[PDB]
Amino acid sequence: MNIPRFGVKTDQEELLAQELENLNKWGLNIFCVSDYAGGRSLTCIMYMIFQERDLLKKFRIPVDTMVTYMLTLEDHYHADVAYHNSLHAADVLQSTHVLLATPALDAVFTDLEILAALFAAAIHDVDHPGVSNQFLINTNSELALMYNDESVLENHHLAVGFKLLQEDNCDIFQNLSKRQRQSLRKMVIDMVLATDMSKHMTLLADLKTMVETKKVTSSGVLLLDNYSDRIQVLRNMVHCADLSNPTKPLELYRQWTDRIMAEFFQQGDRERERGMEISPMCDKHTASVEKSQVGFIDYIVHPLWETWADLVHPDAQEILDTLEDNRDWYYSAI
Amino acid sequence: HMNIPRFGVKTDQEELLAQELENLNKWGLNIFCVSDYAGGRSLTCIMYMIFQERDLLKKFRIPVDTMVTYMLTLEDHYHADVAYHNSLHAADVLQSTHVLLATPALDAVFTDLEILAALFAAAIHDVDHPGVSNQFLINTNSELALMYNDESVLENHHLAVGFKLLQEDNCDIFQNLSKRQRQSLRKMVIDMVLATDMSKHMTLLADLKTMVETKKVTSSGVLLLDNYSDRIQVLRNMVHCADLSNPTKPLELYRQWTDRIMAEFFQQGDRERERGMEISPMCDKHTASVEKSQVGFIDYIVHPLWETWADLVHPDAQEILDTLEDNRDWYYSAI
Numbered sequence: 001m002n003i004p005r006f007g008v009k010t011d012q013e014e015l016l017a018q019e020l021e022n023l024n025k026w027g028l029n030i031f032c033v034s035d036y037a038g039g040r041s042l043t044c045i046m047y048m049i050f051q052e053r054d055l056l057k058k059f060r061i062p063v064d065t066m067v068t069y070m071l072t073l074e075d076h077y078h079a080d081v082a083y084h085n086s087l088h089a090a091d092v093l094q095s096t097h098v099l100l101a102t103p104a105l106d107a108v109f110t111d112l113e114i115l116a117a118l119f120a121a122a123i124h125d126v127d128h129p130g131v132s133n134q135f136l137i138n139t140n141s142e143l144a145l146m147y148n149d150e151s152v153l154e155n156h157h158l159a160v161g162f163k164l165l166q167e168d169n170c171d172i173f174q175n176l177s178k179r180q181r182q183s184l185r186k187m188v189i190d191m192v193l194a195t196d197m198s199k200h201m202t203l204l205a206d207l208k209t210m211v212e213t214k215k216v217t218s219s220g221v222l223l224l225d226n227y228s229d230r231i232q233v234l235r236n237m238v239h240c241a242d243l244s245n246p247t248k249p250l251e252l253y254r255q256w257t258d259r260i261m262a263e264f265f266q267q268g269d270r271e272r273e274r275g276m277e278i279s280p281m282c283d284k285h286t287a288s289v290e291k292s293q294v295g296f297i298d299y300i301v302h303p304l305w306e307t308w309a310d311l312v313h314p315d316a317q318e319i320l321d322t323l324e325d326n327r328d329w330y331y332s333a334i
Numbered sequence: 335h336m337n338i339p340r341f342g343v344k345t346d347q348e349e350l351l352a353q354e355l356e357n358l359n360k361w362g363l364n365i366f367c368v369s370d371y372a373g374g375r376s377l378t379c380i381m382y383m384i385f386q387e388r389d390l391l392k393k394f395r396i397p398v399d400t401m402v403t404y405m406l407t408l409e410d411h412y413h414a415d416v417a418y419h420n421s422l423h424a425a426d427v428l429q430s431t432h433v434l435l436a437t438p439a440l441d442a443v444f445t446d447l448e449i450l451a452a453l454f455a456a457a458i459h460d461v462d463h464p465g466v467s468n469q470f471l472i473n474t475n476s477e478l479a480l481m482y483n484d485e486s487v488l489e490n491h492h493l494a495v496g497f498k499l500l501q502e503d504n505c506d507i508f509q510n511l512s513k514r515q516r517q518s519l520r521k522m523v524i525d526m527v528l529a530t531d532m533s534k535h536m537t538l539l540a541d542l543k544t545m546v547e548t549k550k551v552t553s554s555g556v557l558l559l560d561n562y563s564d565r566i567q568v569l570r571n572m573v574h575c576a577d578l579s580n581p582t583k584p585l586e587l588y589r590q591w592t593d594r595i596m597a598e599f600f601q602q603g604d605r606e607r608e609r610g611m612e613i614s615p616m617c618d619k620h621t622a623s624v625e626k627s628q629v630g631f632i633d634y635i636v637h638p639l640w641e642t643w644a645d646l647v648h649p650d651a652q653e654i655l656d657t658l659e660d661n662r663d664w665y666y667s668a669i
């Protein structure tokens with residue numbers, strides 16, 4: 001198979017090259033990347049992130065195996081889901097890539113831990129059906145039964161992500177040792193399960209406790225002594241990345257908002273057709289797009305990022321300012 | 335439990351939908367219009383209307399709310415981003431089957447249970463289709479090809495999904511069938527859905543042809559099928575004909591069907607090319623003749639199938655055959 005310059009075929013290589021200049025920045029526009037990559041934002045961004053961090057050489061991952069797996073992974077996100085499609089995966093992965101580079105975390109994580117974080121981020125919503133856990137529980141679906149109603153989707157994303165390693169020429173981890181594969185798998189499971197919003201309040205309270213007794217070295221770089229603390233930081237980092245839409249430039253944030261509301265509204269419509277209770281914010285006749293975002297920021301997103309900014313102080317100050325400006329925009333657009 | 339709309343589904347174009355639905359029992363029904371006027375819920379709409387039309391809810395004691403919940407659940411398991419094998423195709427095949435069941439030469443031949451089975455089989459026959467052929471699933475070593483030992487991989491999956499969905503909340507439309515009836519329906523549905531696997535076409539058609547050559551007709555010119563073997567044979571071919579009915583519909587619909595199957599094929603080809611796989615037949619957008627392919631499809635598969643069907647039901651399908659021949663000419667003179 002052909003391995004194109006940026007991992008995917010493109011009719012607009014120069015415009016794509018120009019956006020990829022921003023690979024390592026919060027200000028990257030993944031929507032442009034997606035347009036210029038013919039819809040393959042996940043395969044493109046993951047290829048580039050992997051080349052950037054030299055991960056193929058570091059783990060002896062054959063390049064065609066990497067691309068085969070990434071295409072397979074991307075193909076198992078549904079294009080007909082308005083928000084939880086591969087563009088969201090790509091965005092969360094890219095955001096995780098930037099967050100990994102934060103100065104307060106310099107030289108803290110091993111390449112294996114980094115590998116785990118990025119893989120977790122890429123697979124974290126694979127095969128999302130565009131309806132919430134509660135919808136699967138209320139319909140008595142096979143998936144809710146399979147996972148005892150507990151983190152139904154997050155369990156499924158993990159099973160699908162690892163299972164796809166078994167399709168032809170897809171085992172990107174073939175050259176990791178046993179201990180390496182086991183440690184990565186354990187870390188990935190931990191990170192993806194922590195993306196379940198029902199764990200959000202628990203996650204935030206523990207992040208706070210950890211921040212209270214944080215240790216900094218000479219130059220304000222974090223000291224993470226033990227596994228427990230390292231995976232705590234990584235699970236919260238992927239969570240922050242998942243909830244990073246309101247921290248991005250308003251132009252991008254507004255596109256993410258339209259997408260989530262389209263997805264929620266379609267769920268609400270399906271609920272109404274089936275005689276089910278309509279889930280929170282899923283009723284198009286009564287929901288306010290702008291008020292929902294304000295409440296979302298005030299009670300979920302800002303308290304999370306404020307605690308994160310505390311952890312990595314002063315590295316995330318800008319994100320917090322942006323977050324405050326965006327709250328104000330939605331508050332005024334009411 | 336829920337308030338059942340007049341035509342089974344919510345609509346802001348109720349009168350336009352009512353007009354199209356007058357053609358429910360006809361080959362000339364335009365399902366694309368039904369879809370537009372039923373907010374994209376073609377499968378739920380048409381299936382509801384057919385079940386009322388044949389009084390199947392009362393005959394099998396199927397609660398309406400249960401029927402509707404199942405139908406919406408089934409239709410939602412067809413993918414919208416798949417150009418051809420979406421719920422519109424299922425709606426189409428179901429409605430065609432419904433018309434083929436009513437064909438004068440088959441009058442009083444099938445029980446209500448056999449009719450229920452045929453319609454259920456048609457409605458579920460492609461559910462959860464990923465938009466790629468069996469060979470793509472086999473070549474990629476997918477979980478499904480492994481489960482089913484590379485044999486009718488998709489068709490087995492359609493069956494598994496269609497049946498499993500009965501177990502979702504308030505979805506068991508067969509709750510009031512007896513145990514014998516359930517077993518018999520299950521078996522018939524399996525045979526019909528598996529017969530939609532194109533690698534079976536040759537044997538289905540050879541079997542149908544043999545039946546035509548020794549067919550028995552009653553007093554009125556109505557077909558005589560004494561035994562089950564013959565009946566499931568005709569049902570299998572009927573659902574296969576319906577699945578292969580696009581070239582037999584008015585040209586305007588047939589052309590839309592062709593546009594859709596090529597978009598789906600080219601997408602598969604694009605994915606094969608990305609993966610460095612050998613590109614499946616007619617899936618290369620760079621080197622394909624849409625018109626020749628349609629001509630080949632009719633010449634080698636569709637016309638021998640429909641000619642043999644028309645011979646079985648003679649003369650009820652004469653018009654279907656004429657349209658087919660005219661549509662073939664069009665794609666031929668459009669080469």
Ligand SMILES: CCCCOc1cc(C[C@@H]2CNC(=O)N2)ccc1OC
Pocket residue numbers: 195196197242245246253256257260261264281292293296
């Ligand atoms: C309904 C509006 C209030 C919430 O908005 C959003 C909510 C999410 C959370 C989704 C749901 N569960 C998740 O794991 N992620 C993401 C982006 C949003 O807006 C841009």
Ligand SMILES: CCCCOc1cc(C[C@@H]2CNC(=O)N2)ccc1OC
Pocket residue numbers: 530531532580581588591592595599616627628631
């Ligand atoms: C590639 C063009 C030649 C074939 O065209 C068609 C082929 C099908 C058959 C599909 C493929 N497998 C099936 O089980 N059903 C249906 C409609 C078509 O066109 C209108």
Ligand SMILES: [Co+2]
Pocket residue numbers: 077078079080413415464
């Ligand atoms: Co899809």
Ligand SMILES: [Mg+2]
Pocket residue numbers: 124125153195196
């Ligand atoms: Mg998720």
Ligand SMILES: [Mg+2]
Pocket residue numbers: 459460488530531
């Ligand atoms: Mg099929």
Ligand SMILES: [Zn+2]
Pocket residue numbers: 088092124125195242
């Ligand atoms: Zn997510």
Ligand SMILES: [Zn+2]
Pocket residue numbers: 423427459460530577
């Ligand atoms: Zn079909």
